[PDB]
């Protein structure tokens, strides 16, 4: 299966993720969502970022929201949320990826790295 089963993993991510996110991107990655009866709608979740660049299904990037109370969406890469497109918080990743320091406060995940 040089290029056969490992083949679907490829014939689907042909997308244009972010290719380079340095945390804190508080974007609502418009996520298709759904709602019922009508509405297709599309809304997202403000981010922080820590992922896993893996197994085709780049099922990750626990986006981290503090809206009112507490925590994460492990929003994959594969099709139903109209791209991560927006990266607003530049970078400055502490011990880089896997910056899981769940503790809400004046302890910014200081962004900015230009």
């Amino acid at each position: 299966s040089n290029i056969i089963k490992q083949l679907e993993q490829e014939q689907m991510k042909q997308d244009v993720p972010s290719f380079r996110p340095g945390d804190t991107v508080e974007v609502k990655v418009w996520v298709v969502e759904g709602s019922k009866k009508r509405l297709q709608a599309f809304e997202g979740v403000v981010i922080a970022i820590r992922n896993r660049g893996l197994h085709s299904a780049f099922t990750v990037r626990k986006i981290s929201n503090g809206e009112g109370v507490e925590r994460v969406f492990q929003t994959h890469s594969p099709v139903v949320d109209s791209i991560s497109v927006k990266r607003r918080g530049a970078v400055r990743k502490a011990k880089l990826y896997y910056l899981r320091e769940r503790t809400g406060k004046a302890a910014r995940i200081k962004e900015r790295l230009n």
């Binding site: 759904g34 099922t59 809206e67 009112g68 109370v69 925590r71 994460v72 969406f73 099709v79």
Partner: protein, 121 residues
């Protein structure tokens, strides 16, 4: 979510900690997260309110660390443990408003009051 287990009120009239003492669904339901009905027990409460302290009632589960996922498989885990008591035998969510976010599965048909409040998800 197994007996014991401290759960917070996400609605009102009987603050803070609330003790889960059972899990319905039948014989041997070990857990129950997402948005199942759960027999609760108030242990703190604000001096006021119309629901005092130590009132064995049942309730729902709004935000639970165990997570909730579906579709794509992505998950929404809320590190908290939401109750939201319901006036017991004439089932219905007792209270006025709900606090914080809620779950999209919580919008389960027969419920509905709770989700038109707590502006979120």
């Amino acid at each position: 979510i197994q007996e014991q287990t401290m759960l917070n009120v996400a609605d009102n009239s009987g603050a803070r900690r609330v003790m889960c003492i059972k899990v319905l669904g039948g014989s041997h339901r070990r857990y129950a997260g997402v948005g199942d009905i759960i027999k609760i027990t108030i242990k703190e409460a604000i001096p006021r309110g119309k629901v005092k302290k130590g009132d064995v009632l049942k309730a729902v589960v709004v935000r639970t660390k165990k997570g909730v996922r579906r579709p794509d498989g992505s998950v929404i885990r809320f590190d908290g443990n939401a109750c939201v008591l319901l006036n017991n035998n004439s089932e219905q969510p007792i209270g006025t408003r709900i606090f914080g976010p809620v779950t999209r599965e919580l919008r389960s048909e027969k419920f509905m009051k709770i989700i038109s409040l707590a502006p979120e998800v």
